[PDB]
Design a protein around this ligand. Structure first.
Ligand SMILES: CC(C)(COP(=O)(O)OP(=O)(O)OC[C@H]1O[C@@H](n2cnc3c(N)ncnc32)[C@H](O)[C@@H]1OP(=O)(O)O)[C@@H](O)C(=O)NCCC(=O)NCCS
Ligand SMILES: CC(C)(COP(=O)(O)OP(=O)(O)OC[C@H]1O[C@@H](n2cnc3c(N)ncnc32)[C@H](O)[C@@H]1OP(=O)(O)O)[C@@H](O)C(=O)NCCC(=O)NCCS
Ligand SMILES: CC(C)(COP(=O)(O)OP(=O)(O)OC[C@H]1O[C@@H](n2cnc3c(N)ncnc32)[C@H](O)[C@@H]1OP(=O)(O)O)[C@@H](O)C(=O)NCCC(=O)NCCS
Ligand SMILES: CC(C)(COP(=O)(O)OP(=O)(O)OC[C@H]1O[C@@H](n2cnc3c(N)ncnc32)[C@H](O)[C@@H]1OP(=O)(O)O)[C@@H](O)C(=O)NCCC(=O)NCCS
Lengths: 389, 389, 389, 389
């Protein structure tokens, strides 16, 4: 019944890098337009825009709506943002599918968007500070990467999972290197080109078109990897090298009923067969995808074995290993072109980013059944099953 | 099909008043447990918590999850925040309804929370400021009350509607006084008591139980109203007395299929017959409710005259009069117990706040059909039709 | 040789009290004009204005010149601030006297000024914060009250003194309550009137004339002093009751040669007979007045027993008790009208504020020889000897 | 009677340059140690350290003492900062001289220090900001470079001087470029080595020794200077090319009586014969060196024509040309090694920076009579005459 007509994501920017001063909605605008052009659908025909975005402090009222207008979706349409942290990008798409499934909408653009670079520092100062220093809080750290119940960073959560699953430093380092190697391979081979819509960084002293994921590291070594110090646990195992990065970007999908696509001449990228969200203990939030993936499969009537391709977000090597290990899916069909450790992890947009990767990879290799999953801070997982047409 | 088993809202506090240092997720927690308690449903049976909240900057990862966990909802359920500005609160209920309608969940707690008081000041400072002064931005104003397209305040958008609908000062002032008198009248007769769930302001030198809307003004006079100066247009017509306030508050609804409610021996507050969202010109966003209400009515198969009760959000006197003027519904059945001008307007929670009043008034006066509607910044409207059982 | 022709001070304001929003140079301006007027000296005759000031951040270019200009001092004269912390206001008078002694000026207005209440919060942001929270530093605490060598407050230096000299809590509390009772008695008998020049806080909704020290507590009790908790060492002895306060004010003197006072028929408040400044260990900075007063007396050719009156600043009861114990001067001739624990401590102005208190009490009771001394953060003392004529 | 036994300065850093994160007091300690070492004078013989500094906000209690303590000056000595804006570095040396002249000290270290790069942004937040955006004030701009009476930059006072003296854009650029070429040539020839003491910028990933004035531009061209846009008056004449820069550095002199230097066998850098400080109209502050230099010469009993070398600070080429036009001294003996447009202008230290330049050049060419003079914000000048021994 509901299909993904088309899809597009911007390249993934490094932190304070290519998109350093670009407001997320800008990145979103371009993705909204791309999905529209790629399916031959006019912005005028868009009923609603849903955009997962975790850190919009100071970007003004509802960046989703600013993105939609910037891209030309008429003012008669609607737009909103939502936040299930890292599952935000994928959850948006589910939510948008529900919009058409309940008959409240016909065509929706959904995904996520995030400028981690542009997230401001803040302080509650209405009462006034009579005396003494006060903290200016980094909303990126506090609102997107800190567990709100234990007060520690996501990396600590990953350390909890490493210990629990007995995942050594070498084994998390081995996984990251492979991730970099696969992503680099993919990039050289033109594998990210279909899904990427080039973004124009509007300059003054010149415009700069970005069309390549700049965080991927070329020639990543195991030696350099092994020399890094633990980033969260002083005598820990998680490093800057075996953990995803801080990044900016946007990604989305054009959804509509299979019938509608059919009436249009559009050849969909896939049919949303099912999706699932489930909670877990915040301390081991990286285990989130296990239950969520299984739930989604259950709802689709699929067996783990039925999958031809998987995209399981790499928040941290230790959680990614745990997930694969538990689920037992064939490593070889997971993150075929690299994962977040290489490509980057723009919080609110990462679920839509990985959906794009999955979707263009299923088309190119002809795979039939695919699944995208992500772990979520606070103890949750989100998964989506897709079947090609 | 989908019914609101129960509901509850906190009292609405004034700006920097009783809830001044209360983070929105603490009020959220209170309301979520009330709804459970009220329906006789254990925390453990909740599948998901959906909370609209426009100003979470500084509160930490996904405040919706923090509310859930604090209220006893196990780590297995899931939670997420969403923003559709003042439409958030109501929109969330519709989204939860859809969670059930598509068989993705059985029981959902939905509504909104907001702490305007706790909204921080911010500035983007990763790039550094090499030389010169910079502005510390009030996130409540930028991210909550400032049009992102014209850069002006919602107040000005109200002025645009005033001029366009030729709504004099005296006319808006009249409207304001009435909502105060009506909000004061209802508070005096205990009309808000079923909906309110007392909130314990955890103190040090004393704990304070808040159970009354502190923002309503007793004995509002027209003379005092007419002596106030325009707050947005220097030679304008909108003032602080005929505009909504800056407030704190949380409100939520417990949703489940009608059959499920019957399986549990619950007497529902009503069934959600339809809902709708439509966009309009951002300049006159106050008109929001006209197109959305009509749509909602159309989808429910109801006529304007079928409505027994109506709750149409009092963002500004100007917009409220324009809404009622155009729709034509009998004034006496609209905001019978006062509106946001007197009660308050905790942006992300308001849509669920006005559903609570609609819901408990419909039960108390035995009205069968009702409609809640709000105007949304950026030019949008949200509407929902509820029928008692 | 060099005399003090006249002097004046403003009443000392409470933290965030009467002068909460009054920049220091405005207080300074009134005291430069009272001094001129009190001596029969016109502003066109001033050569230079010298003002101690420790916390001028955010006030603009050289506030000493802003105060001199506001008082009508001609643009041909010059002005400069200096900073020897609490010894500033007194040390300015000694540097003004040297301007004259070396023949480079004939008429100087010297003293201090401080708005502790207007000191801002700051942060070094030129390089930017790539990520993580940063502190907004309270310039009053950082630049005015925190030792830069040990990182702790001036109050801890007082705890070091309390321990080393074995001053109990009881004795420190007895000292602070005699301070209060003495200042209150002098206030009620009109003893502060000659020295206070009234300050007009320019309002909008009314101008307020402040001519009374508002920090002096009336009816201070030993019981209330004794129940206060230690302010700096959780199991310390220094409290808010037995410590000076954070205050605002300005004070000054008009200086010229004795021969010049004599050509003008002026009856000077005193002859500056000597002064001195010496360092001590920062950890016990509060003992500064010992060596500085001993040095000043030696330079004057005076024994301690020759003094008729003393003003030794009350930064903290502990340190004032140690100075008194060590020096051995008759306690009934020291701070006869109360001192800083009751009157307050506007850091850069205090040295001139206690010099005003000495001069007007020496003229009142006919005391021939006096001495004013103050302890200084970072381990220093300053002291000056005055003889009447 | 009072001689400068030795002197030293650090190289001048570019804004956010080599000493971007080096607090002034660390630069000042290196110069205090250098004057001592240069004269055969041990740190335990020092009575007082006097350091002009206009921007100490956020550095902690009295940076002059911090500098002194860091250099090994005993805690029994004293230290203070003072501020007469750009004349501060030179005024401190006259101020040190007066301490010996009056018998209150035997050995003084005086000069100035400044980290314009380390100057913070601030806001008065004690009273609280109920709502709205507020300004984070650049203290270097506000407290160091803006006139307090007219509210405009020091550069607009340079435009006023330009119009009034009818100094064209061409004349200003030609002086600027001659400044750069003369400093490049003295740099390359090694004439700045004697005066400069190398500064070790403590690294983490390497210590860096800074011993060269980095602001100096090599190969400055008239053409690129001519193409610059006006920086303060949109259709003005003062540009970033013909104005001084924003810089970092420290500079000092070690003083003692002539008799004392003779007892020690010290061959002093010169005898302080007179100094003067005079005010002028704040709007044409750049003219202050005129009256101050004539006054200093008159106190020395010298004619302008008796001078063999002059250092006249280059706040802006417009005022520098005005000063040279009025005084009429031979331009060939003024700033023979370039000035502040090329070397840089660390406000609090500049006075001493140009006095080291003057002294070391008088020693190398055998110049007997010299003068150092600087213009001061707020309408003032300072100047000092020096005679070789
Ligand atoms: C791990 C983390 C704290 C690193 O932050 P950081 O210390 O500022 O990171 P950096 O990139 O500066 O790491 C330091 C260095 O490691 C190097 N490095 C990183 N990956 C590397 C690799 N594969 N090989 C070699 N060097 C590598 C960087 O290049 C850098 O070099 P430098 O110090 O010379 O500049 C951060 O990326 C983070 O919080 N990431 C996301 C975690 C997260 O919770 N995401 C949400 C999902 S739950
Ligand atoms: C109108 C608005 C700008 C007022 O802000 P403010 O100036 O800080 O408000 P205040 O409460 O201080 O108003 C000042 C005065 O109005 C007075 N006032 C308010 N309502 C009054 C009434 N009905 N009768 C008499 N006086 C009244 C207050 O008592 C106060 O008197 P005071 O000077 O002694 O305090 C603000 O409420 C606002 O932006 N509101 C929200 C509107 C909005 O855009 N909502 C989003 C939905 S689209
Ligand atoms: C001591 C100090 C830290 C107190 O700061 P604070 O805690 O914010 O001060 P407060 O004024 O709130 O004192 C706390 C309370 O003690 C009470 N108090 C103070 N003196 C009292 C007395 N004599 N009797 C009874 N109560 C008294 C105050 O009224 C207040 O009551 P509250 O809590 O009901 O408001 C501060 O004044 C200080 O740092 N002072 C000295 C500064 C210094 O070093 N200056 C330079 C010297 S080198
Ligand atoms: C004039 C002033 C505002 C310039 O600040 P800014 O605009 O940020 O300055 P910059 O140094 O970045 O701008 C100079 C620009 O012209 C260039 N420039 C400067 N001097 C040049 C020269 N001599 N030849 C060629 N180009 C030159 C700079 O390289 C820069 O080019 P860029 O932006 O491509 O990198 C600032 O240096 C100043 O306020 N100086 C004041 C000194 C003062 O008032 N001190 C107290 C004195 S009373």
């Amino acid at each position: 019944s509901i299909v993904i007509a088309s899809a597009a994501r911007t390249a993934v920017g490094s932190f304070n890098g290519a998109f350093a001063n670009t407001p997320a909605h800008e990145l979103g605008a371009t993705v909204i337009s791309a999905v529209l052009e790629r399916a031959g659908v006019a912005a005028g025909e868009v009923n609603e825009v849903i955009l997962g975005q975790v850190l919009p402090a100071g970007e003004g009222q509802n960046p989703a709506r600013q993105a939609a207008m910037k891209a030309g979706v008429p003012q008669e349409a609607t737009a909103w943002g939502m936040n299930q942290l890292c599952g935000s990008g994928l959850r948006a798409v589910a939510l948008g599918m529900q919009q058409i499934a309940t008959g409240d909408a016909s065509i929706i653009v959904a995904g996520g968007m995030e400028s981690m670079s542009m997230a401001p520092h803040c302080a509650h100062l209405r009462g006034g500070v009579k005396m003494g220093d006060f903290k200016m809080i980094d909303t990126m750290i506090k609102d997107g990467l800190t567990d709100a119940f234990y007060g520690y960073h996501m990396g600590t959560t990953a350390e909890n999972v490493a210990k629990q699953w007995q995942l050594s430093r070498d084994e998390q380092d081995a996984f990251a290197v492979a991730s970099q190697n696969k992503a680099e391979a993919a990039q050289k081979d033109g594998r990210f080109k279909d899904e990427i819509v080039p973004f124009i960084v509007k300059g003054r002293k010149g415009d700069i078109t970005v069309d390549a994921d700049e965080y991927i590291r070329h020639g990543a070594t195991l030696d350099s990897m092994a020399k890094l110090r633990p980033a969260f646990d002083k005598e820990g195992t998680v490093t800057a090298g075996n953990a995803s990065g801080l990044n900016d970007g946007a990604a989305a999908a054009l959804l509509m009923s299979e019938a509608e696509a059919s009436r249009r001449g559009i050849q969909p990228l896939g049919r949303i067969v099912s999706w699932a969200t489930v909670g877990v203990d915040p301390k081991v939030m990286g285990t989130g995808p296990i239950p969520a993936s299984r739930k989604a499969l259950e709802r689709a009537g699929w067996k783990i074995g039925d999958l031809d391709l998987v995209e399981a977000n790499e928040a941290f090597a230790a959680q990614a290993c745990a997930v694969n290990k538990d689920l037992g899916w064939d490593p070889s069909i997971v993150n075929v072109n690299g994962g977040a450790i290489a490509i980057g992890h723009p919080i609110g947009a990462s679920g839509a980013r990985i959906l794009n990767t999955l979707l263009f990879e299923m088309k190119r290799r002809g795979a039939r059944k695919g699944l995208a999953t992500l772990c979520i801070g606070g103890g949750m997982g989100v998964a989506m099953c897709i079947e090609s047409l």
